[PDB]
Structure formats: C-alpha cells, structure tokens
C-alpha cells in the first residue's frame, strides 16, 4: 500500500495519464473516464 511495486506504480501512472480529458481541437476536424471514489482500477 504505502510501499509500492515498480510495475504497479507504472500502470497506475499510465491509467492516470489516460484518464485526463480529450484535446478540444480533435472535435474541430470523450467516451470513457474513471473517477477514483466510485470506480476502482479492479487490479
């Protein structure tokens, strides 16, 4: 928990990077997101 594993830490950082919202410019040429309290990573 408080101490961590390198593989777990990397995947969690990935999941956080994926989470952040879509570029607005893409809509000028957002289906999935997680919220930490109500949705856990299931790992």
């Amino acid at each position: 928990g408080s101490i961590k594993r390198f593989r777990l830490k990397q995947r969690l950082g990935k999941c956080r990077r994926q989470n952040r919202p879509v570029p607005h410019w893409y809509r000028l040429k957002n289906t999935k997101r997680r919220h930490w309290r109500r949705t856990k990573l299931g790992l």
Partner: protein, 101 residues
Amino acid sequence: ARNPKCPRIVKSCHSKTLDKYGLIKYPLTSEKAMKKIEEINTLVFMCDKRANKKNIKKSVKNLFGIECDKVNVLNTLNGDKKAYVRLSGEHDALEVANKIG
C-alpha cells in the same frame, strides 16, 4: 570449452542501446528547479525511467562538460527519471544555466 565455427548472429546494424540523447531528456523548468539552480549549484534533469545513476552522471558530463558531486534520482508518475544533480563547486550552475536558457 567453446570455439564455434560461426557465432549465433553477428548483426552489423547500429546499436539500439541507450545513448546520451535520450538518457537525459531535458532540464526541469519549475520554480523549484530554478531555486535549486540559484541557491545550491544543482541542475535538475528529466531522464529515462530505465536509466541508472552512473549512466546519467556520464551522460551529463558528456553533454555539458560538467562534473557531479552527487546525483539523486526519482521514478515519476509521468514515467521518467527526475535527476537532481549537485555540481562540483569549481564550476557554477549559473554559467550552464545561461548556456541552456
């Protein structure tokens, strides 16, 4: 003991092993990194996750001509290494700072 007729493969391509360019990715741009440069002769660098301290130290000295008293490292949430590098007291971080921007 072994002495084969030919090695398994001798593949003559350029190396895929990590290099100075990519081992050190970029200096940090934060107020904190500015404060470290200003007060304690410390240059703060983003580096590859699979990098190791000696290799970072070697890379910095190759790209910047500069020697490191200690290199302290961290593996980040953004999936890279973040290296705090204390420069030796003969040569000043400010001069290097002027060179990098």
